[PDB]
Paper text:
We also identified the L90Q mutation in both VHH3-M1 and VHH3-M3. The glutamine at position 90, similar to glycine at position 74 in n501, forms hydrophobic interactions with Protein A. However, its side chain can form hydrogen bonds with the side chains of N92 and R20, which are essential for binding to Protein A. This interaction can draw the side chain of R20 closer to D39 of Protein A domain D. In contrast, leucine at position 90 cannot form hydrogen bonds with N92 and R20, thereby removing the constraint on the side chain of R20. Consequently, the L90Q mutation may restore the interaction between R20 and Protein A. To validate this hypothesis, we resolved the complex structures of VHH3-M1 and VHH3-M3 with Protein A domain D through co-crystallization, achieving resolutions of 1.49 and 2.0 Å, respectively. This interaction is characterized by the formation of seven hydrogen bonds and two salt bridges.
Single-domain antibodies (sdAbs), including camelid-derived nanobodies and human-derived variable heavy domains (VH), have emerged as a transformative class of biologics due to their small size, high stability, and superior tissue penetration. Derived from Staphylococcus aureus, Protein A is a 42 kDa surface protein consisting of five homologous immunoglobulin-binding domains (A–E) and an S region that functions as a signal sequence and cell wall-binding region (XM). Using this approach, we successfully reprogrammed multiple human-derived VHs and camelid-derived nanobodies to acquire high Protein A affinity, enabling efficient, tag-free purification via industry-standard Protein A affinity chromatography.
Author numbering:
A (entry chain C): 1 to 127
B (entry chain H): 2804 to 2856
């Protein structure tokens, strides 16, 4: 029902910034469709973990505590993208970052609440 | 949004951020004005940690 493709990962020095993007498309998708888009990240040796989410219709946002103030999530409902600005990056932010979406309101901040997934983009923060 | 506006000007003049960092934090303020206070707080932390030695 929605297709997602994420991009923007790469190699960055500690303290640096990167911006990820996720292109959203769907046959019945519109500017106030009641969807939730999020970013998850999978660090080395770890499972996918919640980073941030945005309600597509209202643009209300929520962040994992570990990224609050350093990362911002936003969405453009003309171009149909969701972006993640990442500042003040640290080696522990190294991970594969995935765009994800749900057609509705998540009941958790876990992977099980999101039924659509991007393929992932790889972020490496060197020191 | 006044929290957004004064935060923008503070970040602009932080002396120990480089251009890429300043520009990234400014973009965050545009991305999510609801996080202005937290974005400013993290810029301050980076400005402090990058104080020249």
């Amino acid at each position: 029902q929605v297709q997602l493709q994420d991009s923007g990962g790469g190699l960055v020095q500690a303290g640096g910034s990167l911006r990820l993007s996720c292109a959203v498309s769907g046959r019945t998708f519109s500017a106030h469709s009641v969807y939730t888009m999020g970013w998850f990240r999978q660090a080395p040796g770890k499972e996918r973990e919640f980073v941030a989410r945005i309600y597509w219709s209202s643009a209300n946002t929520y962040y994992a505590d570990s990224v609050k103030g350093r990362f911002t999530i936003s969405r453009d409902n003309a171009k149909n993208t969701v972006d993640l600005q990442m500042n003040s990056l640290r080696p522990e932010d190294t991970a594969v970052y995935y765009c994800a979406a749900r057609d509705g309101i998540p009941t958790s901040r876990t992977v099980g609440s999101y039924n659509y997934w991007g393929q992932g983009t790889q972020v490496t923060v060197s020191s | 949004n006044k929290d957004q506006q004064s935060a923008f000007y503070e970040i602009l003049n932080m002396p120990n951020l480089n251009e890429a960092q300043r520009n990234g934090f400014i973009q965050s303020l545009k991305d999510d004005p609801s996080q202005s206070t937290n974005v400013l707080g993290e810029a301050k932390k980076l400005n402090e940690s990058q104080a020249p030695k």
